[PDB]
Short mmCIF file of C-alpha atoms (C1' of nucleotides) in Angstrom, two decimals:
data_model
loop_
_atom_site.label_atom_id
_atom_site.label_comp_id
_atom_site.label_asym_id
_atom_site.label_seq_id
_atom_site.Cartn_x
_atom_site.Cartn_y
_atom_site.Cartn_z
CA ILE A 1 86.01 129.05 110.51
CA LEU A 2 84.52 131.75 112.69
CA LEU A 3 81.66 129.32 113.47
CA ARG A 4 83.66 126.43 114.84
CA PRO A 5 84.18 125.82 118.59
CA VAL A 6 87.58 126.29 120.21
CA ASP A 7 88.39 122.58 120.49
CA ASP A 8 88.65 122.36 116.70
CA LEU A 9 91.92 124.30 116.96
CA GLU A 10 93.22 121.12 118.65
CA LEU A 11 94.72 122.80 121.70
CA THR A 12 97.07 121.25 124.23
CA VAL A 13 95.20 120.14 127.36
CA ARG A 14 96.90 123.02 129.18
CA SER A 15 95.56 125.53 126.66
CA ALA A 16 92.05 124.12 126.20
CA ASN A 17 91.95 123.81 129.99
CA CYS A 18 92.71 127.49 130.50
CA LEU A 19 90.40 128.78 127.77
CA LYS A 20 87.60 126.59 129.10
CA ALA A 21 88.24 128.09 132.55
CA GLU A 22 87.61 131.63 131.22
CA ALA A 23 84.42 130.68 129.34
CA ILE A 24 86.11 131.47 126.03
CA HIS A 25 84.17 129.04 123.84
CA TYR A 26 84.10 130.43 120.29
CA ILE A 27 86.87 131.52 117.93
CA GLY A 28 85.25 134.94 117.78
CA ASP A 29 85.77 135.15 121.52
CA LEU A 30 89.38 134.13 120.85
CA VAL A 31 90.02 136.82 118.25
CA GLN A 32 88.23 139.77 119.84
CA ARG A 33 90.53 139.37 122.87
CA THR A 34 94.08 140.66 122.57
CA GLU A 35 97.44 139.18 123.56
CA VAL A 36 97.63 141.09 126.84
CA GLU A 37 94.08 140.10 127.79
CA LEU A 38 94.99 136.44 127.30
CA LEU A 39 98.36 136.73 129.06
CA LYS A 40 96.40 137.90 132.11
CA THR A 41 94.55 134.58 132.26
CA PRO A 42 95.82 132.48 135.19
CA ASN A 43 98.03 129.59 134.05
CA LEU A 44 98.19 131.07 130.52
CA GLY A 45 101.89 131.75 129.99
CA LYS A 46 103.95 133.12 127.14
CA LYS A 47 104.77 129.86 125.37
CA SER A 48 101.18 128.66 125.59
CA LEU A 49 100.13 131.93 123.97
CA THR A 50 102.76 131.61 121.25
CA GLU A 51 101.57 128.12 120.36
CA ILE A 52 97.99 129.38 120.24
CA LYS A 53 99.25 132.06 117.87
CA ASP A 54 101.05 129.54 115.67
CA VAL A 55 98.12 127.14 115.41
CA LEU A 56 95.54 129.87 114.84
CA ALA A 57 97.79 131.43 112.20
CA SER A 58 97.90 128.04 110.48
CA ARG A 59 94.21 128.58 109.60
CA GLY A 60 94.67 132.02 108.03
CA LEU A 61 93.50 133.76 111.21
CA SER A 62 95.18 136.13 113.66
CA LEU A 63 94.55 137.82 116.99
CA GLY A 64 92.94 141.18 117.57
CA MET A 65 90.47 141.75 114.74
CA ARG A 66 87.23 143.53 115.66
CA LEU A 67 84.14 141.54 114.70
CA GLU A 68 80.99 143.65 114.49
CA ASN A 69 77.85 142.44 116.27
CA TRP A 70 79.47 139.18 117.37
CA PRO A 71 77.48 136.99 117.65
CA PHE B 1 92.59 96.08 113.31
CA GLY B 2 94.53 94.32 110.54
CA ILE B 3 94.66 97.09 107.94
CA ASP B 4 96.95 96.20 105.02
CA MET B 5 97.76 93.00 106.91
CA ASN B 6 96.89 89.32 106.63
CA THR B 7 95.84 88.75 110.25
CA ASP B 8 94.35 90.67 113.15
CA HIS B 9 96.35 91.00 116.37
CA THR B 10 95.43 91.35 120.03
CA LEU B 11 97.21 93.45 122.66
CA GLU B 12 99.92 90.82 123.23
CA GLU B 13 101.69 90.79 119.87
CA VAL B 14 100.99 94.50 119.38
CA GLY B 15 103.03 95.03 122.53
CA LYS B 16 105.61 92.58 121.16
CA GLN B 17 106.42 95.28 118.57
CA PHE B 18 108.61 97.46 120.81
CA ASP B 19 107.57 97.08 124.47
CA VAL B 20 105.44 94.19 125.75
CA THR B 21 102.98 96.15 127.90
CA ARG B 22 99.20 95.84 127.67
CA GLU B 23 97.70 98.93 129.28
CA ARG B 24 100.02 101.26 127.37
CA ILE B 25 98.81 99.73 124.10
CA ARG B 26 95.20 100.16 125.19
CA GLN B 27 95.70 103.78 126.25
CA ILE B 28 97.55 104.58 123.02
CA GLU B 29 94.73 103.08 120.95
CA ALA B 30 92.08 104.96 122.94
CA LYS B 31 94.01 108.23 122.58
CA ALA B 32 94.21 107.64 118.83
CA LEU B 33 90.48 106.89 118.77
CA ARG B 34 89.36 110.08 120.50
CA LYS B 35 91.88 112.01 118.40
CA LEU B 36 90.29 110.67 115.21
CA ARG B 37 86.79 111.31 116.57
CA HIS B 38 87.69 115.05 116.55
CA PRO B 39 85.30 116.70 114.05
CA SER B 40 88.23 118.25 112.18
CA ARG B 41 89.61 114.98 110.76
CA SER B 42 86.49 112.80 110.58
CA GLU B 43 84.16 114.37 108.01
CA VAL B 44 85.69 112.23 105.25
CA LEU B 45 84.93 109.11 107.32
CA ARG B 46 81.46 110.16 108.51
CA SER B 47 80.25 110.08 104.89
CA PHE B 48 80.48 106.27 104.89
CA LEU B 49 77.61 105.72 107.34
CA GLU C 1 67.92 109.06 93.05
CA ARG C 2 66.49 112.33 94.40
CA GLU C 3 66.82 113.80 90.87
CA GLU C 4 68.30 117.19 91.69
CA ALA C 5 68.81 119.89 89.06
CA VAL C 6 72.62 119.76 89.14
CA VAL C 7 72.25 116.09 88.24
CA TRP C 8 70.48 117.25 85.08
CA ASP C 9 73.24 119.69 84.16
CA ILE C 10 75.81 116.94 84.77
CA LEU C 11 73.81 114.59 82.54
CA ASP C 12 73.76 117.20 79.79
CA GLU C 13 77.52 117.59 80.10
CA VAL C 14 78.17 113.82 79.94
CA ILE C 15 75.86 113.31 76.94
CA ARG C 16 77.17 116.50 75.32
CA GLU C 17 79.20 114.64 72.71
CA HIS C 18 78.96 110.96 73.68
CA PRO C 19 77.44 109.00 70.77
CA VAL C 20 74.88 106.26 71.30
CA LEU C 21 74.09 103.23 69.14
CA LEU C 22 70.53 102.70 67.91
CA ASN C 23 69.41 99.25 66.74
CA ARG C 24 66.19 97.77 65.36
CA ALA C 25 65.52 94.06 65.02
CA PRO C 26 65.83 92.25 62.67
CA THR C 27 69.33 93.51 61.82
CA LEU C 28 69.36 92.52 58.16
CA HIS C 29 72.40 94.65 57.29
CA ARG C 30 74.89 96.92 59.01
CA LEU C 31 72.63 99.95 58.62
CA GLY C 32 70.40 98.36 61.26
CA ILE C 33 72.80 99.71 63.88
CA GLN C 34 73.96 103.33 63.66
CA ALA C 35 75.51 105.96 65.91
CA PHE C 36 73.77 109.23 66.78
CA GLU C 37 74.42 112.21 68.99
CA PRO C 38 71.72 112.21 71.70
CA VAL C 39 69.48 115.18 72.45
CA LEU C 40 67.76 114.93 75.82
CA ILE C 41 63.98 115.12 75.49
CA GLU C 42 61.09 114.96 77.93
CA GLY C 43 59.09 111.81 77.37
CA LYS C 44 59.59 108.07 77.19
CA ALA C 45 59.96 107.51 73.43
CA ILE C 46 63.05 107.67 71.23
CA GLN C 47 62.83 110.29 68.49
CA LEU C 48 64.26 109.04 65.20
CA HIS C 49 65.35 111.04 62.17
CA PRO C 50 62.98 110.26 59.26
"C1'" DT D 1 132.26 162.72 143.94
"C1'" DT D 2 130.47 158.97 145.79
"C1'" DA D 3 127.73 156.27 148.96
"C1'" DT D 4 122.93 155.06 148.91
"C1'" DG D 5 118.58 153.42 147.70
"C1'" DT D 6 114.95 152.83 144.52
"C1'" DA D 7 113.69 150.76 140.13
"C1'" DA D 8 113.82 148.28 135.52
"C1'" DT D 9 115.11 143.95 133.91
"C1'" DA D 10 116.75 139.42 132.83
"C1'" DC D 11 117.47 134.85 134.55
"C1'" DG D 12 117.00 130.98 137.84
"C1'" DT D 13 113.37 128.20 139.89
"C1'" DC D 14 109.73 126.10 142.88
"C1'" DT D 15 106.05 124.43 142.22
"C1'" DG D 16 101.48 122.91 139.62
"C1'" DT D 17 100.02 120.59 135.33
"C1'" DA D 18 100.25 117.03 132.46
"C1'" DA D 19 102.18 113.21 129.68
"C1'" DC D 20 104.16 108.27 129.80
"C1'" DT D 21 103.91 104.18 132.01
"C1'" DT D 22 103.08 100.16 135.00
"C1'" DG D 23 100.31 97.15 138.82
"C1'" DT D 24 96.78 94.94 139.57
"C1'" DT D 25 92.41 93.93 139.99
"C1'" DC D 26 87.98 92.97 138.57
"C1'" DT D 27 84.75 91.61 134.93
"C1'" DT D 28 83.30 89.28 130.92
"C1'" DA D 29 83.38 86.67 126.64
"C1'" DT D 30 84.86 82.39 124.88
"C1'" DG D 31 86.41 77.71 124.38
"C1'" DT D 32 85.95 73.31 126.15
"C1'" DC D 33 84.24 69.18 128.58
"C1'" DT D 34 80.34 66.36 129.85
"C1'" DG D 35 75.69 64.54 130.22
"C1'" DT D 36 71.21 63.64 127.93
"C1'" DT D 37 67.91 63.19 124.05
"C1'" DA D 38 66.75 62.86 119.33
"C1'" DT D 39 68.21 61.25 114.98
"C1'" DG D 40 69.95 57.99 111.73
"C1'" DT D 41 71.06 53.40 110.48
"C1'" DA D 42 70.24 48.43 110.03
"C1'" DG D 43 67.99 43.66 110.13
"C1'" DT D 44 63.78 40.90 109.71
"C1'" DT D 45 59.15 39.34 108.69
"C1'" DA D 46 57.50 31.96 106.32
"C1'" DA D 47 49.13 30.45 103.31
"C1'" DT D 48 50.70 31.96 97.63
"C1'" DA D 49 51.83 34.85 94.45
"C1'" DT D 50 56.43 33.59 88.71
"C1'" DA D 51 57.80 37.85 80.57
"C1'" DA D 52 56.17 46.29 81.36
"C1'" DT D 53 54.51 50.37 79.67
"C1'" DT D 54 52.70 54.40 78.13
"C1'" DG D 55 52.06 57.11 74.65
"C1'" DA D 56 51.71 59.33 69.61
"C1'" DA D 57 50.73 60.98 65.75
"C1'" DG D 58 48.64 66.75 58.70
"C1'" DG D 59 56.83 67.89 57.77
"C1'" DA D 60 59.49 69.05 54.10
"C1'" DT D 61 63.28 68.83 52.21
"C1'" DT D 62 68.33 67.53 51.61
"C1'" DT D 63 72.78 64.42 52.38
"C1'" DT D 64 74.98 60.05 53.51
"C1'" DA D 65 75.81 55.16 54.83
"C1'" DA D 66 73.91 50.15 54.73
"C1'" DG D 67 71.36 46.29 52.35
"C1'" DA D 68 70.57 44.08 47.92
"C1'" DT E 1 73.78 50.77 40.60
"C1'" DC E 2 69.08 50.99 43.17
"C1'" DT E 3 65.93 51.20 47.89
"C1'" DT E 4 65.52 52.40 52.83
"C1'" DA E 5 65.98 53.97 57.21
"C1'" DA E 6 68.42 57.44 59.90
"C1'" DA E 7 70.26 62.33 60.62
"C1'" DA E 8 69.91 67.18 60.51
"C1'" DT E 9 67.77 71.80 59.74
"C1'" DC E 10 64.18 75.02 59.76
"C1'" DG E 11 64.55 84.32 61.33
"C1'" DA E 12 65.11 88.26 64.90
"C1'" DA E 13 63.86 90.81 68.85
"C1'" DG E 14 59.66 91.12 72.56
"C1'" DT E 15 57.49 88.57 76.63
"C1'" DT E 16 57.94 85.03 80.04
"C1'" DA E 17 58.55 83.71 85.97
"C1'" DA E 18 56.91 76.31 88.14
"C1'" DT E 19 52.93 72.55 90.95
"C1'" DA E 20 49.11 68.67 92.32
"C1'" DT E 21 49.21 59.47 91.64
"C1'" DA E 22 51.39 55.51 93.97
"C1'" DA E 23 55.34 48.49 106.01
"C1'" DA E 24 56.25 48.27 110.57
"C1'" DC E 25 58.93 47.16 114.73
"C1'" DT E 26 63.08 46.97 117.01
"C1'" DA E 27 67.84 47.55 118.25
"C1'" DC E 28 71.94 50.12 118.34
"C1'" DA E 29 75.22 53.83 117.66
"C1'" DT E 30 76.04 58.55 116.76
"C1'" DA E 31 75.38 63.47 116.61
"C1'" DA E 32 73.39 67.45 118.48
"C1'" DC E 33 72.06 70.53 122.20
"C1'" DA E 34 72.40 72.42 126.72
"C1'" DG E 35 74.82 73.57 130.97
"C1'" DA E 36 78.94 74.71 133.80
"C1'" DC E 37 83.63 75.66 134.45
"C1'" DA E 38 88.11 77.59 133.45
"C1'" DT E 39 90.79 80.82 130.81
"C1'" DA E 40 92.21 84.60 128.20
"C1'" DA E 41 91.23 89.18 127.02
"C1'" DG E 42 89.83 93.73 128.08
"C1'" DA E 43 88.10 97.79 131.30
"C1'" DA E 44 88.74 100.47 135.33
"C1'" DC E 45 91.31 102.81 139.02
"C1'" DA E 46 95.21 104.17 141.12
"C1'" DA E 47 99.69 104.83 141.68
"C1'" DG E 48 104.48 106.12 140.20
"C1'" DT E 49 108.13 108.52 136.98
"C1'" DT E 50 109.33 112.67 134.39
"C1'" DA E 51 109.80 116.89 132.20
"C1'" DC E 52 107.97 121.33 131.30
"C1'" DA E 53 105.05 125.53 132.24
"C1'" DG E 54 103.84 129.73 134.91
"C1'" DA E 55 104.45 133.02 137.58
"C1'" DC E 56 107.47 134.41 141.50
"C1'" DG E 57 111.83 135.59 143.54
"C1'" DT E 58 116.30 136.92 142.81
"C1'" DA E 59 120.25 139.37 140.89
"C1'" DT E 60 122.04 143.06 138.22
"C1'" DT E 61 122.39 147.51 136.35
"C1'" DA E 62 121.25 152.22 135.96
"C1'" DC E 63 119.01 156.25 137.60
"C1'" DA E 64 118.23 159.22 141.43
"C1'" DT E 65 119.48 161.13 145.99
"C1'" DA E 66 122.38 162.19 149.65
"C1'" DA E 67 126.75 163.82 151.57
#
DNA sequence: TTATGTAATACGTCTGTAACTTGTTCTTATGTCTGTTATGTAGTTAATATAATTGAAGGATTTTAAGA
DNA sequence: TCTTAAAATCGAAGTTAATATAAACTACATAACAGACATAAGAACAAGTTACAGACGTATTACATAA
């Protein structure tokens, strides 16, 4: 799952839009960032972030883990 | 496409289901098509090539 | 068709206890057809118990 | 003590994104009509000529109907 | 009661892959093939209608400061 691109998460056009604007392309890039780092993204609000959290937690994953030597 | 159905239907009678509008039916079908093309729900269908 | 190894293990598991019927013509009596447990062998000839 | 003024904080909210939907407008695939050529059908020919036809072959036993 | 012609039967697999002779002209109607046009179906763009998001601005309360 760590080797799939972000679009696989099936994000709302608002979300995928924002994360494609910050060059966050890979789920490792999603997880190594924290909640506050994402909430600082322009046009990334609280409810967008909470739906990212819900969908990513659907796949047994969570925010904030440290991945060594990524990638 | 006529799945589980005797006949195939064009945009007209597909609209005749709830609202008789052509371009909405087309856009709905295209949205469904790119949604299915998503690599997450198409591996089971790609095996039939 | 590619004859992979796992195909061979699967074949062993299917033939593990599936009997096969051996026949020789002319079938003069009912002993001309009998059931045997197959053992997979390399070759092209059927090995028959004496 | 109490006005005052800064500051945290929670809630409206104005605006920027995006979904749903229709107009309409243009393009193309298809069904149909029409004209022309090839195909398919049919009728006729008037010295005279007048009982096929081609094979094919070392069978050995039974049972069952016709003929007398 | 005795010939005499017919009728029927005659082991399994296995393999196997065929041939090869012998009217014409004319007249008519029909079917097929090609081309062009109209129509129905879809593709493309643009607009409108609508609610929600995202961060800002505001309002409220509590702490600090001033009298």
